[PDB]
Amino acid sequence: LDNGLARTPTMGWLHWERFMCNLDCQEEPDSCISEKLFMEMAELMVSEGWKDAGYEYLCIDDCWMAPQRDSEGRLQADPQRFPHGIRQLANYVHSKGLKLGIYADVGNKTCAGFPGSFGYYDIDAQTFADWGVDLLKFDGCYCDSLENLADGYKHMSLALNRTGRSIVYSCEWPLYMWPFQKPNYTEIRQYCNHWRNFADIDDSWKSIKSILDWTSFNQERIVDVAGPGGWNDPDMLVIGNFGLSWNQQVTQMALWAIMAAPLFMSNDLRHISPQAKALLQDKDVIAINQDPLGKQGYQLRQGDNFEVWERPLSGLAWAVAMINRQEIGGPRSYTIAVASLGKGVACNPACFITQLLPVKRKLGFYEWTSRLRSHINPTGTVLLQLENTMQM
Amino acid sequence: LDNGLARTPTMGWLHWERFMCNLDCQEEPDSCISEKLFMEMAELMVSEGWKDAGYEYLCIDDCWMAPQRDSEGRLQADPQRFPHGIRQLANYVHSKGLKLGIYADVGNKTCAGFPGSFGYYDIDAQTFADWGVDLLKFDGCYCDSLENLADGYKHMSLALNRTGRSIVYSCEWPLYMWPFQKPNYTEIRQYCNHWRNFADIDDSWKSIKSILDWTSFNQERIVDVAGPGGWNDPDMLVIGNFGLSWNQQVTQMALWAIMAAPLFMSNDLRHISPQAKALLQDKDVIAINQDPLGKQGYQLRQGDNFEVWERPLSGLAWAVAMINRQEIGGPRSYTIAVASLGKGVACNPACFITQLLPVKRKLGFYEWTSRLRSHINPTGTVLLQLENTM
Ligand SMILES: *[C@@H]1O[C@H](CO)[C@@H](O[C@@H]2O[C@H](CO)[C@@H](O[C@@H]3O[C@H](CO)[C@@H](O)[C@H](O[C@H]4O[C@H](CO)[C@@H](O)[C@H](O)[C@@H]4O)[C@@H]3O)[C@H](O)[C@H]2NC(C)=O)[C@H](O)[C@H]1NC(C)=O
Ligand SMILES: *[C@@H]1O[C@H](CO)[C@@H](O[C@@H]2O[C@H](CO)[C@@H](O)[C@H](O)[C@H]2NC(C)=O)[C@H](O)[C@H]1NC(C)=O
Ligand SMILES: *[C@@H]1O[C@H](CO)[C@@H](O[C@@H]2O[C@H](CO)[C@@H](O)[C@H](O)[C@H]2NC(C)=O)[C@H](O)[C@H]1NC(C)=O
Ligand SMILES: *[C@@H]1O[C@H](CO)[C@@H](O)[C@H](O)[C@H]1NC(C)=O
Ligand SMILES: *[C@@H]1O[C@H](CO)[C@@H](O)[C@H](O)[C@H]1NC(C)=O
Ligand SMILES: *[C@@H]1O[C@H](CO)[C@@H](O)[C@H](O)[C@H]1NC(C)=O
Ligand SMILES: NC[C@H]1N[C@H](CO)[C@H](O)[C@@H]1O
Ligand SMILES: NC[C@H]1N[C@H](CO)[C@H](O)[C@@H]1O
């Protein structure tokens, strides 16, 4: 989408994975979808260094609207859970130096059953623009056919442009194209800033395995289309919750950096361990994800329960991730010819290698003929930056 | 097994899950199956409070033997990886105040392909006794028929008794009896101190889920036979390794306590976090697991992606575990009528409830009419002790 936005993968916070559609504000006040939740989350994004690290977009997922539209036929926020309205929430978020994302659906209803946008694309686009929305996640539930789906997505894109406001457009279009047909990713990139490809993520290592395996299996279809202005979305970051071990959290961070993925945290910033905060705020790994070249990485090797991924970076630098998929035993040894890395350019004539995950450690100079030796934890990942150099 | 042993579930350390069959002592001297590894683990079991917590048995799994038997036809440890022999290793372990477990197989070969004990049951039993072995894990690979399997397990049991040495006898008989026929668990308890029921564990929440589900699905068959001298073995504790989140480790600890399971750590005691060390050395949870009454807990309730297990304890006390099996969202609320717990006697007329996991916290007094409300983390478990007001 050529709207000047998402020149690097969008960074922020989305409530869906962690808070879901909790409507019971009387019995579960701390987890229900309310304006107080988003206000407190914005406060913590500022105070706890999340904005400094790059997380800019505070995003509302499903279950923010009233059961029906107002008298004029416009979307209205829920009266009890959002008394002061989306405009006042956007004002608050902007006053903290952040940006506000909102949710809508292309069909007649949202996935949770709230008013859909079909028939009101222009009305809803102008409503979001007036409220001060900076990002729109557009879902695909309750849609008849591919004609309706495609037309709705393209229509909402053009309507948002016609509002004249800069609004990041996050689509779920490709994901909703199966079981009908394989998406034309060029068409989708034409209209979307990023697009969800695969099923929703949950708080489990199984889910990350599934997302990564699907991505590596379909990488010839989706890697080259990604770039500044249009990204593949493998869904939210679940670091800081309950289902991932430390090494699995490291794996998700490293490979979301490799995949040039939008970094949308879905956690409770009020209850997050120092470990997970440091991982999610890792300056070097975020720098990899935010590389100005904007070239998505890919799976280089796969076998012996090992995976090797790499991502090209600006200035002849490369990121390399090595995953141990063996879920038994201990740290497993892996060696690779340094010339096999970075298409043979990362370490020609030499490269300086810096391990970034699980710990940061300078590994030294590697000649084009040398071999890299590493040990990877079960379900863990070793992330490295290779800086091309002529010294040595 | 009425040999006076395993009156509480056996506690110790087994190398299999974490170290497997690592024979590459040239490239990984510190991780290969060698007497140096077991010496380091014994040293740390003393130094780091593991013996104090109750972990007593330092056990050797497969891949300790030489490729073949000696002149006399006896088992021998690997010459290079175990230079000083099992007897001297046992002497060292005993000098540290610990006990030594060894591994053998009922069939023609061990699962890794090393000398089996079929045909040598008496010889091998007497050899282990001479060496000073205090525990035998008996595997079931490379076995012709169910008859050979059963006969071998009973034979080795009786041979160990005839050596005159107190040796804890750990069997894998039930695991190798399915899917051919259902094991007679009374028969097995007659010959074994504990017995492996289900597939091997690995460093994954999936493995723990499968073990728990199998146990609850077959609980009508296996719960009542367990007791002092004979326990169900859901395989090793993998807390402290790589595949489990904190809450999944909490779940494993709590429900291995509920299940009156042998507590066999399989980890690297040289590199273990303070968190996992504190969980594995939890005094109250170990006390639950080591409850002298020896009544195995069971799944009381299952539904809404929630699980409720409970175990009767000594002195009219009860342990209650609540699992959240929903792997998405956040801490989920669960409420239960306190009268529904402990067969309806735990809190009649009242009970004091103490949460032990994930954190220790006094919850106060609960009348027989009260409801217990809790929030359980996804894939996590809340463990509670109920003390009746008497
Ligand atoms: C509505 O849609 C139209 C297109 O249908 C869209 O117009 C496009 O806007 C982008 C972004 O402003 C334009 O790209 C810029 O072009 C100018 C002129 O050449 C350059 O100065 C810009 O370069 C800077 O920014 C780039 C990042 O985009 C960097 O790569 C560069 O190094 C500079 O820093 C940039 O190339 C584009 O030309 C137009 N296209 C058309 C056909 O008009 C408009 O922005 C949309 N509006 C809304 C509100 O959505
Ligand atoms: C061999 O088996 C006998 C018979 O089961 C064991 O004898 C029992 O030992 C316990 C020890 O506390 C006593 O409480 C039982 O009363 C004994 N039963 C009988 C019938 O004698 C004996 O312990 C076993 N010995 C070894 C070395 O395993
Ligand atoms: C399981 O095996 C046990 C013994 O191995 C069986 O119990 C024995 O049954 C015989 C039958 O005459 C009695 O004489 C013995 O006294 C019993 N021994 C014990 C220790 O109970 C038992 O019946 C078998 N179970 C099933 C279901 O067949
Ligand atoms: C919404 O419902 C109307 C009335 O049944 C139908 O004509 C229309 O196609 C629906 N919209 C979508 C996007 O399916
Ligand atoms: C994809 O869509 C674009 C624009 O809609 C079009 O130019 C292109 O031919 C399409 N590709 C395929 C393979 O249909
Ligand atoms: C071991 O092998 C021999 C020869 O093949 C066979 O007769 C015997 O039954 C086997 N024993 C077991 C326990 O498999
Ligand atoms: N893919 C289905 C989508 N619908 C949910 C909101 O109802 C989440 O936004 C999810 O991303
Ligand atoms: N059930 C299979 C058994 N065989 C392995 C040793 O080779 C482990 O002891 C495992 O417990």
Numbering used by the authors:
A (entry chain B): 32 to 423
B (entry chain A): 32 to 421
Article sentences:
α-Galactosidase A (α-Gal A, EC 3.2.1.22) is a lysosomal glycosidase that hydrolyzes the terminal α-linked galactoside present on macromolecules such as globotriaosylceramide (Gb3).1,2 Mutations in the α-galactosidase A gene (GLA) are found in patients with Fabry disease (FD), one of the most common lysosomal storage diseases (LSDs), which is characterized by the progressive accumulation of Gb3 in cells. To unravel the binding mechanism of iminosugars with α-Gal A, N-methylated derivatives 20–24 were synthesized, and we determined the crystal structures of α-Gal A in complex with compounds 4 and 5 at pH 7.2 and 4.5, respectively, and 8, 20, 21, 23, and 24 at pH 7.2 at 1.97 to 2.61 Å resolution.2,32 The structures revealed that these pyrrolidines bind to the catalytic site nearly in the center of the TIM-barrel domain of the enzyme. The bindings are primarily stabilized not only by hydrogen bonds (H-bonds) between the hydroxyl groups of the compounds and the residues D92, D93, L168, D170, E203, R227, and D231 of α-Gal A but also by a salt bridge between the endocyclic amino group (endo-N) of the monobasic compounds (pKa ∼ 7.0) and D170 of the enzyme at pH 7.2.
Previously, the dibasic iminosugar and potent α-Gal A inhibitor 5 having the (2R,3R,4S,5R) configuration pattern demonstrated good chaperoning activity in cells transiently transfected with various mutant α-Gal A.23 Notably, iminosugar 5 exhibited superior pH-dependence in its inhibitory activity compared to its monobasic parent molecule, 4, suggesting that it binds to α-Gal A at pH 7.0 more effectively than 4, leading to better enzyme-stabilizing or chaperoning activity. Surprisingly, in the compound 5-bound structure of α-Gal A, the positively charged exocyclic amino group (exo-N, pKa = 9.1) of 5 forms bifurcated salt bridges (BSBs) with residues E203 and D231 of the enzyme at pH 7.2, where the carboxylic side chains are essentially deprotonated and negatively charged. By contrast, the corresponding C-2 hydroxyl group of 4 forms H-bonds alone to E203 and D231 at pH 7.2. This finding most likely reflects the stronger binding affinity and better protecting effects of 5 toward α-Gal A at pH 7.2 compared to those of 4. In contrast, the titration curves revealed that the endo-N moiety in compound 5 exhibits reduced basicity (pKa = 5.5) compared to that of 4 (pKa = 7.0) due to electrostatic repulsion between the vicinal ammonium cations,34 which implies the formation of an H-bond between endo-N of 5 and D170 at pH 7.0 but a salt bridge at pH 4.5. Given these structural findings, it is conceivable that the pH-dependent protonation states on the amino groups of iminosugars and ionizable residues in the catalytic site of α-Gal A regulate the binding status of the compounds, i.e., the stronger binding of 5 to α-Gal A at pH 7.2 is due to the formation of the BSBs, which are missing at pH 4.5 when the binding is weaker and only H-bonds are formed.
